[PDB]
Amino acid sequence: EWDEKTFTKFAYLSDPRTRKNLVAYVLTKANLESNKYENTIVIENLDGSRKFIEDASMPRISPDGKKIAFMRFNTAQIWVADLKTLSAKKVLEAKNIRSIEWNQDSRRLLAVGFKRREDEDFIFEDDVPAWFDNMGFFDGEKTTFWVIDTEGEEVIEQFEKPRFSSGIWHGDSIVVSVPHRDVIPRYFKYWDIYLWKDGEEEKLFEKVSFYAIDSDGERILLYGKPEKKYVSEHDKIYIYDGEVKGILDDIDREVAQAKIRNGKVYFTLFEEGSVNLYLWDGEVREIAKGKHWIMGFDADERLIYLKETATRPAELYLWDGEERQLTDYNGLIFKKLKTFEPRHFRFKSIDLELDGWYIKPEIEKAPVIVFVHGGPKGMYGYYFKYEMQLMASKGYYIVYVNPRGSNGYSEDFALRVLERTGLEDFQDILNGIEEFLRLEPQADRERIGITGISYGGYMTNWALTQSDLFKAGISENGISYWLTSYAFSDIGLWFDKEVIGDNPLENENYRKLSPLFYAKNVKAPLLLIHSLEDYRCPLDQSLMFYHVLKDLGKEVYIAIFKKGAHGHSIRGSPRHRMKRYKLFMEFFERKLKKYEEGFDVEKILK
Amino acid sequence: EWDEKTFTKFAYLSDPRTRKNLVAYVLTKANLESNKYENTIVIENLDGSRKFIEDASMPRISPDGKKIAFMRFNTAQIWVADLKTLSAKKVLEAKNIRSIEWNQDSRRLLAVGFKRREDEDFIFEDDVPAWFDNMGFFDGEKTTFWVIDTEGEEVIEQFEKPRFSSGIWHGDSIVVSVPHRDVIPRYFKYWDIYLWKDGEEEKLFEKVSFYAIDSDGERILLYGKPEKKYVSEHDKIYIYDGEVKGILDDIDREVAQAKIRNGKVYFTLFEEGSVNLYLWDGEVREIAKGKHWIMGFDADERLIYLKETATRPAELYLWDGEERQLTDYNGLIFKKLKTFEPRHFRFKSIDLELDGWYIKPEIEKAPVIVFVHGGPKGMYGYYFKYEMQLMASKGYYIVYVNPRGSNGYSEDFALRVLERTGLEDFQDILNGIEEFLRLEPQADRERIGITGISYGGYMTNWALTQSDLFKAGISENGISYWLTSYAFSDIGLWFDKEVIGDNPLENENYRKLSPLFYAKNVKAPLLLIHSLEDYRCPLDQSLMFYHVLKDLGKEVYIAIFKKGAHGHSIRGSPRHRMKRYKLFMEFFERKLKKYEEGFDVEKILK
Amino acid sequence: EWDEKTFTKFAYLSDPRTRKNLVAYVLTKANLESNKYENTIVIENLDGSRKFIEDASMPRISPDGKKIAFMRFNTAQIWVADLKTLSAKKVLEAKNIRSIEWNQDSRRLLAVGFKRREDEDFIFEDDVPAWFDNMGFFDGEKTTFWVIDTEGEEVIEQFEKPRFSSGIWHGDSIVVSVPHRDVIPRYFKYWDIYLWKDGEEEKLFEKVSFYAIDSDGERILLYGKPEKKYVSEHDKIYIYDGEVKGILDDIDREVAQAKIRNGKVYFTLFEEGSVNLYLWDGEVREIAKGKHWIMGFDADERLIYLKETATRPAELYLWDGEERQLTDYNGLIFKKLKTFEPRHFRFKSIDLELDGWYIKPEIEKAPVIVFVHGGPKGMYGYYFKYEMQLMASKGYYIVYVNPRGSNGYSEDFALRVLERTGLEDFQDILNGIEEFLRLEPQADRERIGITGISYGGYMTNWALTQSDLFKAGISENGISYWLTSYAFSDIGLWFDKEVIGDNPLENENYRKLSPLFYAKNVKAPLLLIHSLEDYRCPLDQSLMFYHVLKDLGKEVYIAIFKKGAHGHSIRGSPRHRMKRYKLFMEFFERKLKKYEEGFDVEKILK
Ligand SMILES: [Mg+2]
Ligand SMILES: [Mg+2]
Ligand SMILES: [Mg+2]
Ligand SMILES: [Mg+2]
Ligand SMILES: [Mg+2]
Ligand SMILES: [Mg+2]
Ligand SMILES: [Mg+2]
Ligand SMILES: [Mg+2]
Ligand SMILES: [Mg+2]
Secondary structure (H helix, E strand, C coil), X not given: CCCCCHHHHCCEEEEXXXXXXXXXXXXXXXXXXXXXXXXXXXXXXXXXXXXXXXXXXXXXXXXXXXEEEEEECCCCEEEEEECCCCCEEEEEECCCEEEEEECCCCCEXXXXXXXXXXXXXXXXXXXXXXXXXXXXXXXXXXXXEEEEECCCCEEEEEEXXXXXXXXXXXXXXXXXXXXXXXXXXXXXXXXXXXXXXXXXXXXXXXXXXXXXXXXXXXXXXXXXXXXXXXXXXXXXXXXXXXXXXXXXXXXXXXXEEEEEECCEEEEEEEECCEEEEEEECCCEEEXXXXXXXXXXXXXXXXXXXXEECCCCCXXXXXXXXXXXXXXXXXXXXXXXXXXXCCEEEEEEECCEEEEEEEECCCCCCEEEEEEXXXXXXXXXXXXXXXXXXXXXXXXXXXXXXXXXXXXXXXXXXXXCCCCCCCCHHHHHXXXXXXXXXXXXXXXXXXXXXXXXXXXXXXXXXXXXXXXXXXXXXXXXXXXXXXXXXXXXXXXXXXXXXXXXXXXXXXXXXXXXXXXXXXXXXXXXXXXXXXXXXXXXXXXXHHHHHHHHHHHCCCCEEEXXXXXXXXXXXXXXXXXXXXXXXXXXXXXXHHHXXXXXXCCCHHHHHC | CCCCXXXXXXXXXXEEEEECCEEEEEEEEEECCCCEEEEEEEEXXXXXXXXXXXXXXXXXXXXXXXXXXXXXXXXXXXXXXXXXXCCEEEEEECCCXXXXXXXXXXXXXXXXXXXCCCCCCEEEECCCCCEECCCEECCCCEEEEEEEECCCCEEEXXXXXXXXXXXXXXXXXXXXEEECECCCECCCCCEEEEEEEXXXXXXXXXXXXXXXXXXXXXXXXXXXXXXXXXXXXXXXXXXXCCCEEECCCCCCCEEEEEEEECCEEEEXXXXXXXXXXXXXXXXXXXXXXXXCEXXXXXXXXXXEEEEECCCCCCEEEEECCCEEEXXXXXHHHHCCCCCCCCXXXXXXXXXXXEEEEEECCCCCCEEEEEEECCCCCCCCCCCCCHHHHHHHXXXXXXXXXXXXXXXXXXXXXXXXXXXXXXXXXXXXXXXXXXXXXXXXXXXXXXXXXXXXXXXXXXXXXXXXXXXXXXXXXXXXXXXXXXXXXXXXXXXXXXXXXXXXXXXXXXXXXXHHXXXXXXXXXXXXXXXXXXXXXXXXXXXXXXXXHHHHHHHCCCCEXXXXXXXXXXXXXXXXXXXXXXXXXXXXXXXXXXXXXXXXXXXXXXXXXX | CCCCCHHXXXXXXXXXXXECCEXXXXXXXXXXXXXXXXEEEEEXXXXXXXXXXXXXXXXXXXXXXXXXXXXXXXXXXXXXXECCCCCEEEEEECCCEEEEXXXXXXXXXXXXXXXXXXXXXXXXXXXXXXXXXXXXXXXXXXXXXXXXXXXXXXXXXXXXXXXXXXXXXXXXXXXXXXXXXXXXXXXXXXXXXXXXXXXXXXXXXXXXXXXXXXXXXXXXXXXXXXXXXXXXCCCEEXXXXXXXXXXXXXXXXXXXXXXXXXXXXXXXXXXXXXXXXXXXXXXXXEEECCCCEEEEEEECCCEEEEEECCCCCCEXXXXXXXXXXXCCCCHHHHCCCCXXXXXEEEEEECCEEEEEEEECCCCCCEEEEEEEXXXXXXXXXXXXXXXXXXXXXXXXXEEEECCCCCCCCCHHHHHCCCCCCCCHHXXXXXXXXXXXXXXXXXXXXXXXXXXXXXHHHHHHHHHHHHCCCCCEEEEECCXXXXXXXXXXXXXXXXXXXXXXXXXXXXXXXXXXXXXXXXXXXXXXXXXXXXXXXXXXXXXXXXXXXXXXXXXXXXXXXXXXXXXXXXXXXXXXXXXXXHHHHHHHHHHHHHHHXXXXXXXXXXXXXX
16 A cells, blocks of 8 residues: 555665676665665675675775775775675765775775864855755855875875866866856866876866766766856767767757776766666667666676666666666565556647646546656756655646756757746646646546645746646645745756846846746645755745735745755655655545645644 | 673573574673673574674474574564575564464465464453463463465464463464363363464364474374373374374373474474483484483574573584584583583382482592482483582582482383372482482582472472471472462463372362471471462462471471563573572572571572 | 542642651652652641751651761762751661661661572572562562661671561660561461660560560560461550560551650541550540541641541641641642532441442542552541542532452451452441432432442453443452462462462352453453553552453553552653553543543543
């Protein structure tokens, strides 16, 4: 049976790594009773023999295949284990490390972390932004780079860089990507790239729209473009060996992840609902393309990847030749648990033809939940979406589309949304719902709800202020006012200028496209959901909407989770997440399936 | 030198398991200074290479030999380790699990446990009995069955059954043995047996006197009889594959343990003082028969067993072909510690000829301690009996017999005791002592003591009320009044009806054969020993005898151990057990070897 | 509204003391949320000015009125405070002190306590009984006497005496009352009395049936008789000044409490349902006589006492001249809480006329709960009985009587019960119920239940085995088998010989008058309630009855409280007591008011 606890039953795989004949990855479990994620590194032969590093993550297999570094968290500590016996030693006790990567010598690690002011009474800020979702307040944060010798166990080189810099090995050098500073740092837009060795550095690029993501010791793999006008442009990949060479210049899709392994580049593309795995070895070759999301991959002598589908969390695969499924962690649970395959439909919207999906429940007519993805350059299609399976099992149609602005299509399709949030993209959603209703006469047009997180939250607010179609909404971590998004959120300073418009203090678009200013129009009951550590869409986006809607006599409720960032629906504590799922299902049960007055959360939850 | 601490010096082996070329078992040590049992799983090659899983028990080797599940206790947790490197992951945090067993797939475990009401202020009972020795109060206890997937780490099936049910895998099915319910559950007498799979079940047997103990995936091994009139009847073994086939119908001895391994059944028999290991492969073949107790065994590609003798705790052996001793954990200790081999004697008693044993000390005449085993269907012979070696080292003859009622002989011999406790079986003991005294003129007939636990405690009480032969007694966890045994103990409701008689509220036998009612006859000093968590023979059995004996002016003492069940002499904490051994030896020193007035335990113990 | 929590709302007063113009007493509150009794000493002027010693009890005001000793518990510590400012110093850190009493010098205290063997693993006993209700296992307990100098803060004299001795000051001497030892100590029957000073002693009495309870420095007040044949005989009081003088020889009622204050004796008598306060100053004078229980009193320059009634817990009063109520702790609570005054009725039973009471609810007919008091020499009448008010508020008639055997009447009436438990006294109960039913036609004869604790538990068991009148019973801490009461309980060795009969191992009365042996007769559902530290009626009394009743197919349930002695219904933790009250009310709701099958305590309680 699907309910608010079902997500705790799945094994969650991440961070796959492979060297020689070995694969490692992390197995994570949500333990509802201790209220903790549990992490286990699993190392597999390729045999199917498994061994374990318990209470650990960040597996990094040494280039020589003889050992594995990993992190245990608590302060964090870096450990190194022999892969033969897995006997381990603690190497470095590390607060605030975000990455470790072996040097080609299988002796040194590069660790990138951060340092802040850390006064126990006040944060002090002189740069921007003051905070970032999932990181906290910056408090003057600088990036730190440590070269650690894992034999002697010492930091043998260290240097700092501006906030939000990154570093990868390039042979015995380090390629350092630093946000370019103009009036403010040009986050996500321009970087300066350096080559660093032994306390000295050479600037490789100045003010470019890509950063270094991998190296094979001869070539540097760069991610982005040489110059973007919009951060929303499709990120591409480039090889640099002295000359910068685009390897996908003729493919009008965005790269999701990429790695270089002896001059061959493995990479994934967002494509019409899927995230597909390709290889480039002079030409682009399809590796794993279908109705799925390749969530992660790694390549050395072998190529392994994590593939998630609409109805299964990610499992591990090995590519031959041919795809071979390596793991089946959830196979036994899913023998007993019904899932629902989405049905793809094309529909016309204004000038375009778009992708939609719906899931039909067993079935009278059935109520309908419309889901809107975040972004706007998010993408729905073929990954595992817990709420959708959950509500389909409870008797709802689920419908959702990729409006213009979505990832997975041409760059132009993504960029059509800019300065037009709530305009054509909302029409796309309404037109997809109209086509879905034509396809499915058993969908009850008189019981359609809408929900989404982030931009989907924005769109749920917007939908209730612009349309009388919806009977209920659940809007989460959303946007009701772009001006405060611009001035308050971690990314607003550059992101809103692009997506909403320039001259934000004068531009009328900031109120014209803001649900807050049309609150009077709202007629359907609404549940707002927010979390107190969300800095991507800060609390005022929900609480202002909630207060103004109350000031106008509207039926509205707000659940404010005391912990959690923007992605807390998926990343918050298991107990936190269970409570959100329960609220979510009960709001729709009691406001969409069959309207009931009030919403007594004490009685409803326990 | 033997004393109250010597038992802490031995290594105690248990729970042997074998798959392919591997053996595992548990090594337990009594640590007197931390006052804890320590458990180490040892895995041996077969090489004699050893490896270790520390602070753990319940080794279960997966059918494929690639891994080992085990328990660590504290709440209990199930872990799974790769047998190659022994790297381990925690699979399930498990309060109240009593068994784990792998499925043939080496992926799922079946765990059988229990659940109770657990109010912190009161136990509430609506079934029977309210408590069970070594388990506590039932508090509404149900049995729970969990199928655990050890990859994904989740319970994927669970169901509950009445109290005291058991479960074993049968291929992908579970055979569930449940006590049959009439007016009360017919514990130890009738079961219903089910075949369970995927939430459904078929009843295989109704109200039978056997339960399922093993399976080879085609055949179910059943333990008991199709129908017993008396629970005291010899348990036998049956193979069920559609038809129930007795495999020892022509052998009039009781099976102690049995396992099925690809259509071959390995099993032990109680026989005249020994517990011997046999194989059935169409005919019964002797494997390990002699003056010893096969305490445990396991078979897969190899057959291993634990063999204990009168003078050595259990050591591990492998059977070829020929018996090979694999371990010698206590060999070095026993080079320095004198032991005493018992001398077997036959004697006549009324209509029968019986087995007796005695140990002769160095040697004047020497005082004599007569030991009486529990049961009555207990059995003395060739296992390691700490008190016997201990008191023999201190200058005592030790004598003990198997009276009628004992295990190890024909069923009829066992059943002669029923309704006759303290009658012929006591005469058997007196006749064995008479023959022993004839054999050993250096035994001092004027200094004979008697002691026993459980039924042996009953018999020590009884002996002091019926005979003037004994100069002292130590009676432990015994019986002085059958009526309260019937109505108060965990098993009395069915057990006393069989062993003492029907219509217990009217049957005069319940007082006629009860030491309490002859307390006036007592002339020898007596130490009573009890423990507060003994529900097999509850406290009133000792304390009523103690109070009535004091009320009659008799010299009697009672030591009431604040923790511990019926078997606390062997299972209580090392400090608890050391104190009991010390009391036991000192009572006999000061009341049997040389009578001394009083018994100042403060001075005597420390 | 009355429910399982209402008892927590009352202030409970105890231990009144008075010197000069001061009164002190203890105010106790049951705090359900911390689950603790809270104790506050209150000192009142006589003004009505109040002051406080918080978290303390055992107020002892010094003879000179200048200071107050008291105990704080945790180990216990004796403190002394100046009564003017209540500034306090700790005098002696005291494990196991049971009493403190000032010497006439207002400098020394006499503290009487106890010491035991205290091995952490086992209790060791060589005397009798092994345990006592509300004290635990004796573990070789001796009585200790300490003279404490409260200035220098030192024990300046100490000596020990047999278990269960007591001591009071007599000027600079100590009168020591010690149980007389024959085959066993003659507890509650004969004492030896000593006069002790400065390490020497003179025996004042040998083997007498009284002990010293107070002194005025010239006269010793003795409680009991010079010689009792039965402990059940009425205790009287005597003044000893060289000659023993009976002061109530012509009053055929038992003294409940007595104190001597400059040759005047204040004392209470059990009389037909009341406990009344008298003075003797050469003649007996009535002080406080009525429908009430004088729970405690003290006299110096003033006379104060605690008076409880059927409808109010005890409040404090001062006697002038005339009774003046001093406190009204519960007056505000009882403005809001309905109470029910019992209605007294006379009835004929065989050869006697007896007292009964009933409470009529608002009112169809109403179901009836018959309550039976403990003892048998207990007494119902005019004290505050929580369950009665509780069940009357829930729509039940409450009826209860003083059968022969009760205190409050002639000695002969008390002694009629001896060897006749369950015979005439049970007929008395049946005849009282018959008269009550005639008085109250709205009582539903088809819904009568019975309940009691202790002897009342015995009688509830007995009632269900002998009568078909009752539709339900709740039997608590009761008797189902006298033989085990005799041999197992703290007092059985002497108490059962008197109340049930001599030669307990042969006397057929022990089974003839035992509910256990008539268990087959039971037809009404029964809840048994017991507690694991009850040594007055040990657990087997309930659990044997429960098991045998289950063995006979009867509907019976048992609630076994994990902590608590015989009086745990009133003395157990507030949470423990709340749960018992809830069970008690729900059993009657669901088995007496309207029979319902089953009894799911999980659902019923929470
Ligand atoms: Mg280190
Ligand atoms: Mg991008
Ligand atoms: Mg373009
Ligand atoms: Mg785990
Ligand atoms: Mg058997
Ligand atoms: Mg036979
Ligand atoms: Mg002091
Ligand atoms: Mg009395
Ligand atoms: Mg008389």
